[PDB]
Design a binder for this molecule. Structure first.
Ligand code: HIS
Ligand code: HIS
Ligand code: HIS
Ligand code: HIS
Ligand code: HIS
Ligand code: HIS
Ligand code: MG
Ligand code: MG
Ligand code: MG
Ligand code: MG
Ligand code: MG
Ligand code: MG
Lengths: 147, 147, 147, 147, 147, 147
């Protein structure tokens, strides 16, 4: 049973969609026990987007830089988040489209039971469109996995 | 070029991730020129989710009840939103899973140029999991289409 | 190398798209060695479409009624054709859509080399849309396989 | 309700499949109000196919060169057409296959109701096969969208 | 780094494909620390296949019957295993096909490092074909996930 | 009806999951009427995997080098096998992952009836993971097609 005050997806997105400067949200989340990561990436290569999120997450300590288990968890969460962004074909450049994304990676236990352990949410928000500036619309994606 | 203050996708999600009995968000969006629709639907059948959204959108005036054009725009936007929710296979019950969703449909021009016309954003947020309460996690979906 | 005058795909589609009350196009195709099957099926169930095509193909003798080999070839060609019709998710009713289709199944050798043997083409044309009539547009699909 | 004499999909495919050295089928379509674009592209890169179609459609005036709305409509119709050609994975060269395509893009209102406005159809026909010539079969795809 | 003597996928499959009677393999695996589950399921409903594997796994203690975390791990492994079986469309009956499967669920650490924790492999083997006995060919699928 | 002692899929996997320097499995299979091919390939490009299999199959005599028919059968069998390996998106490098595979291709009649002709099974087994050694898990894929 998800804890209303700990809905990892909702929190990662509210953080991702907030454009305030005086921004205590990251601090607030961390104070509540969440591991947080924020970044940006623009590319016509999906592998670069995956690479950016992975690197940023490991450098911020959201997931372990050693071992495979957590990288595996993150990879599949990223893949799922990319589904909402690509909608059908997980291809960007090869389908003549590119993305300008902001991404948030949030790690923690979103349930009332401590036995559920840590879960990770990968949220993406930005634009997807032609290689030409302006010709685009928004894109969104949230992937959640146990970790 | 997307108008910074009229990012329909971002606005539709934020509207959905809001939990203030007295937000006045809907009215505020309507006063800014947006046609807004909110609803909820729980089911193991994707077709019931699609139908709820279409019914709510037509009843609220978000899209014309007559003609195919707007219904077509909404259907595809709904399909794109379902991609983020289903991530790979647009199936619920047949894959032994179910959803509990809140949905928002916004309709207006998110671009700086009036020539871009109206666009529609279907946003979904809730849970997806086994038919058993508690065994589930969050799910998001955002589809954007022109009208 | 495809024989210019034996393009099984093109031929099956021309037959499918041309309303010839007279001048049996089927007779001409058969006179040239092609085995031909034509039919129509309307449904919100893809399995009924697949079934209609199989039954009609076997009844007309386009594929053997006994054995698996030929049914296997036909099934896959049918699946490939359905991809053009469904465009992403091979689902109809579960996604609140229905099809009204006319289908053609052609069998013969479309290559200059006789050693290539028989191939089969399954072609579909009609409409796909909401259950309510009027809300729909055209749909097409062609699947080709060796047999 | 689709106008029997204005089936944009069927018309785009007939144009595509019929080799008319004389009697300009294009002139007749244009005389009836349709905006038409024809072209050919051979490649192992789907983005070049998409690009060829967009450039040709804009050059011929089938869709506006400025703005995003119409390019958006065309892009999605192109994607839908590619589904019939690729049947599962919208990949060409990365899966060791290449296409030789002829394409047609038609724009007009295919419905009895003038209120429906313009719709667009992207149709593709040609071959798909191994890089080595001779090893290939036909491929088709039709995408329809409102614009 | 995978441990050659502990390759969870390979082991689950060798167990699944072994048709011996005097069968000490399950005992051998369990003696080595693996949690093992074996079953059979024939159906035209993918949800029944997923249901069978889940139930069998929980009744055999391969995964916890309480909580969501492990059910989540198993569900996604099952989904991945089903990809090899369905190859493109995770649909059975709706696409007029059915399966007769044997399944093995193996849980344990396949790496040299103990820090990798438990992983789960879901292996499927049997036939997939028409609803008629005989008209079918073999099908295989292996899904691996951390747990 | 599949011949219990000639289950091509099962035989191809078992052949691949074997690690005896002196198994004599290949010769034993060839003496039972099967055409056999074994190979290995590591890459971040699916097209290189497809090419290795095709090259190995033609060089070993598993399929004819001339004509398209057998190449077509093999290509689709290879594609079906890749589904189990890629599970959803038939992409490797573009999704920042790579494979280290062993493959086996068997060709013969697995049915009790000689009228079913020859069929081909492409089996894949190895690892899929990040471009970094150690960060990966097992992957399987089996594709079956008629010739
Ligand atoms: N609109 C496309 C992106 C795009 C490509 N070219 C123009 N727009 C999408 O939904 O992904
Ligand atoms: N977790 C699954 C849903 C589910 C089914 N059973 C348990 N969970 C998903 O990502 O859709
Ligand atoms: N537009 C949908 C069909 C549809 C469903 N509802 C309305 N139209 C398609 O492209 O398949
Ligand atoms: N047969 C493949 C094309 C191909 C690749 N190599 C040989 N043929 C298809 O259906 O797309
Ligand atoms: N051969 C089909 C199954 C089938 C359905 N009907 C006959 N066979 C497959 O590859 O899944
Ligand atoms: N685990 C991924 C592969 C991978 C990429 N990076 C790490 N692992 C899969 O299931 O394909
Ligand atoms: Mg999940
Ligand atoms: Mg449509
Ligand atoms: Mg098959
Ligand atoms: Mg778009
Ligand atoms: Mg994995
Ligand atoms: Mg083919």
């Amino acid at each position: 049973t998800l804890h209303k005050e700990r809905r990892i997806g909702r929190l990662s997105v509210l953080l991702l969609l907030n454009e305030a400067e005086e921004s205590t949200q990251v601090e607030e989340l961390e104070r509540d026990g969440w591991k947080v990561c924020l970044g940006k990436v623009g590319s016509m290569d999906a592998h670069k987007v995956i690479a950016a999120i992975e690197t940023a997450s490991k450098k911020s300590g959201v997931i372990q830089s050693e071992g495979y288990r957590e990288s595996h968890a993150l990879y599949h969460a990223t893949m799922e988040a990319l589904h909402g962004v690509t909608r059908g074909e997980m291809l960007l450049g090869s389908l003549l489209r590119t993305v300008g994304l902001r991404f948030a990676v949030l790690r923690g236990n979103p349930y009332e039971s401590e036995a559920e352990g840590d879960w990770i949410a990968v949220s993406l928000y930005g634009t997807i469109g032609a290689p030409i500036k302006g010709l685009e619309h928004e894109t969104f994606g949230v992937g959640i996995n146990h970790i």
